[PDB]
């Protein structure tokens, strides 16, 4: 597997819940980048060097993803709730001396990110979320069209071992299909093939796939519950935040993203990028530039 | 290898313009067509058909593309697996037997064929029984987190091919057994005859049979929904006397009664809960049989 972060260090950050793997590069204020599904930290390989000019970039595999340890799940999928993941990543950052940092997340990592921002806002200077709405918003807008478009939210949330058994027949197909279907182009062309190899290899592990289901099960249950409490209490993110979404991505299909985030964040700016779901790989120049400007403010 | 679960029933291959319908046929009296759903075959009626055969000519048909029925070639709109097309084919199948006015009971997908038939060609039906469904439109209109999680397979199997086909091929035996177990009241296969499960397992083992089921659900998400929507908006109601049976632990139930929802679709509908999960004729065969004979006798 290729090193897509030449000159970046590599850290195994030990936490109470297992090791976080991270590539580390650049200098300046600490910036944590979190990938999503079905990816690993290497999805940032096109924009992390450009951020590394101005920030200490920490490119972490999510708890349970990539090369991070997989905490053993439980009946409530607790370690793979965004709340628990946020906690583990806060722990990881503290091991590096980062108790106050900037954070950008995409997909699942963006959900960890806004949940981190709601649970422990004092940990964040600024927050960027890439192509998501809050988990609560997806479920609340889950009508016919949206249930078809993001079917995997209900399918991967099905009780073990049903998704795992189906995914295990041909893991390569599913990871490649999920990658392809949410690009603007509808194929794998936006991706560096060495990055695809990373995604494909991570997905080839049955326990890694279980973890991803656990993450989606948390997303259907505890994640939704945590979010529901916040939205019904009027708890807003107080960290300055950037919401970037793809014009052909997931967030914009059932809502106007900036309108939704103004319900969740007291201080949010947003910008569409011409892109599918995978903003940092489909549109790396426009994404890196959006993140450099926001975090330099 | 595959047990004969309808002793005394014969076996018909009914020709239609879109391929053969397989049916087990028994009894005498007014014609009664029994339609199975997903992921079963006609054999799901094996505990209730003998009871109905005391008073009806019972035709126990494999849905087009299911079981041993032929699989008509699908197209971009999944047209032969829309409930409208399936109903036209079964109307044609019944005509081959001289049945132009018949009683109809369907479960699951076959229940969807059945109420669509009732809507499109009500004159063909003496009475209609639907087991453990609401109309397709109602499921989709009620699509929320809870339902999306409970009937996930409606959006999963409706994904463009070959995605659900490929994943179903990952472990087809587990999938059909999981689908059967998870919708029973017990949560295992204990309510099913092991010989019937073999039929379901063997039908589900053919990739082309699984593809058709996916076509059925693709139609369930698109054309079937649009056909239902037109009837909603035009105020068209099923005029034939209708029985709506649902499992107390089935898919149709939730918070609002299936009966109140069927009253928006049917002029003349009675309804009863059966202590059962989704698979009323196998989980509650006596309670289902008696409700059906009671209703179809009138
Ligand atoms: Ca298996």
UniProtKB/Swiss-Prot annotation, chain A:
Q: What class of enzyme is it?
A: hydrolase
Q: Keyword annotations for this protein?
A: Hydrolase
Q: What is this protein called?
A: Fluoroacetate dehalogenase
Cysteine pairs bridged by disulfides in the record: none
Superkingdom of the source species: Bacteria
Q: Which organism is it from?
A: Rhodopseudomonas palustris (strain ATCC BAA-98 / CGA009)
The chemistry this enzyme catalyses reads: a haloacetate + H2O = a halide anion + glycolate + H(+); fluoroacetate + H2O = fluoride + glycolate + H(+); chloroacetate + H2O = glycolate + chloride + H(+)
In its keyword annotation, does this UniProt entry include Hydrolase?
yes
The residues the record assigns to binding fluoroacetate are 108, 111, 152-153, 216
């Amino acid at each position: 597997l290729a090193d897509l972060f030449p000159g970046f260090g590599s850290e195994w950050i030990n936490t109470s819940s297992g090791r976080i793997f991270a590539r580390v590069g650049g200098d300046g204020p600490p910036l944590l980048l979190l990938h999503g599904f079905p990816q690993t930290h290497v999805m940032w390989h096109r924009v992390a060097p450009k951020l590394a000019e101005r920030f200490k970039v920490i490119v972490a595999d999510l708890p349970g993803y990539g090369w991070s340890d997989m905490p053993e799940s439980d009946e409530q999928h607790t370690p793979y709730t965004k709340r628990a993941m946020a906690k583990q990543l806060i722990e990881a950052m503290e091991q590096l001396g980062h108790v106050h940092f900037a954070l950008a997340g995409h997909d699942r990592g963006a959900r960890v990110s806004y949940r981190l921002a709601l649970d422990s806002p004092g940990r964040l200077s600024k927050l960027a979320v890439l192509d998501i709405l809050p988990t609560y918003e997806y479920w609340q807008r889950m009508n016919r069209a949206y249930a078809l478009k993001i079917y995997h939210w209900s399918f991967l949330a099905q009780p073990a071992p049903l998704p795992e058994n189906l995914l295990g027949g041909d893991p390569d197909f599913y990871v490649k299909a999920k990658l392809a279907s949410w690009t603007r182009a509808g194929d794998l062309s936006a991706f560096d093939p060495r990055a695809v190899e990373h995604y494909r290899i991570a997905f080839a592990d049955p326990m890694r796939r279980h973890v991803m289901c656990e993450d989606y099960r948390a997303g259907a249950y505890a994640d939704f519950e945590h979010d529901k409490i916040d939205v019904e209490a009027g708890n807003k993110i107080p960290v300055p935040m950037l919401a970037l979404w793809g014009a052909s991505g997931i967030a914009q299909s059932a809502a106007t993203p900036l309108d939704v985030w103004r319900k969740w964040a007291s201080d949010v700016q947003g910008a569409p990028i011409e892109s599918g779901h995978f903003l940092p790989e489909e549109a790396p120049d426009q994404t890196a530039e959006a993140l450099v400007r926001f975090f330099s403010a």
